[PDB]
């Protein structure tokens, strides 16, 4: 029995934008959280159905890790049950959940002088998603009775727009990195 490791999940670089996020699966390793307890400087922990004491001596049947780059208002939005652009369009998260949620502030790395446009998010949808499903699509949005015929024109918008993060960023706006883990307590 050996290390997982967590460092490849947490410490690694250039992780995904809010849509087309990624899912990773973890098995057959020692938990050894104490290195996380010592090393972590993370500005938020919140755990649902579990407590940080009574956390060692637990066996988790499956472990999944999901990674995001986010603007701090979304950091409050990522809680279950909320409303907002994210909760309506992207990464809906259910109230019935057993995980714990981690965030730390990456402004020294993720922000860019002149903006880090590569982080992309979706602004209009005909209906709102069920939890844990993606969309990777483009079908040009119509804001009138007449078609815009698959091309730009009147009342016709491309659904995608770019975040900007800068030096001297708005402290609530500036970028955050968020990681989520999901567990079930049914088998070793």
């Amino acid at each position, epitope marked *: 029995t050996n290390l997982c490791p967590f460092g490849e999940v947490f410490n690694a*670089t250039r992780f995904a934008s809010v849509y087309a996020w990624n899912r990773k699966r973890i098995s057959n390793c020692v938990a050894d959280y104490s290195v996380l307890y010592n090393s972590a400087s993370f500005s938020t922990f919140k755990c649902y159905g579990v407590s940080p004491t009574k956390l060692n001596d637990l066996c988790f049947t499956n472990v999944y890790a999901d990674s995001f780059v986010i603007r701090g208002d979304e950091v409050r939005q990522i809680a279950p049950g909320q409303t907002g652009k994210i909760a309506d369009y992207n990464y809906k998260l259910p109230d019935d959940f057993t995980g714990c949620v981690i965030a730390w502030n990456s402004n*020294n*790395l*993720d*922000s*860019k*002088v*002149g903006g880090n*446009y590569n982080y992309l998010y979706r602004l209009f949808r005909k209906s709102n998603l069920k939890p844990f499903e993606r969309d990777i699509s483009t079908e040009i949005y119509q804001a009138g009775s007449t078609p815009c015929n698959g091309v730009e024109g009147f009342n016709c918008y491309f659904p995608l727009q770019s975040y900007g993060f*800068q030096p001297t960023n708005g402290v609530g706006y500036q970028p955050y990195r968020v990681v989520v883990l999901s567990f079930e307590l049914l088998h070793a």
Partner: antibody
Amino acid sequence: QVQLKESGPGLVAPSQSLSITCTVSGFSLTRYGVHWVRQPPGKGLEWLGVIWADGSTYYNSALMSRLSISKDNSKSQVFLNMNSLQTDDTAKYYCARDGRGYDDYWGQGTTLT
Amino acid sequence: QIVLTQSPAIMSASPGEKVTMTCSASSTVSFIYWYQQKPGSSPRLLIYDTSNPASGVPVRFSGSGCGTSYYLTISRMEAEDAATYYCQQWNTYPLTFGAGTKLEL
């Protein structure tokens, strides 16, 4: 063409002041950003840089007395003036523009002191 | 962040003698841009994030790095004459320009 051009470069004098202007054509100063970089003779370059839509300013300098941006925002030119610049600085002065990325264009001006 | 640079003084006997470029930095930097200069006159031309080239430069370049240290590797032809390199960081102000000197003859 998309262009940066250098205009009234400073010329030799016993007086230690020097002036230089740079001029831009094929894009507006309200649409992109332009950055200003200096080289001492026999040395690497030295930098002053700011990012704006218009009218904004950012600076870091080892010295800043008499120093803030000088600009003629009719698109005509950008201007530099310092009392002692002839001895202190500016063997060559360079005029440069940046966009989102991979659209970065450079112009070179030569200053006599 | 201050950045520090090393360079050799070297005499070649053929092309294909491999070449390395290095920069070392005082503190964490996330984004860097990669530039080559010819001596004597100093227009500027850029190789940007993900180390993709701009227009008008040979295809044989690749860059990958580790924190506080950046590397890209070149193998053949005109770069033996043409390459002098500068490294600059774009994560926070001031944008320090860096310094050094390099030659091959």
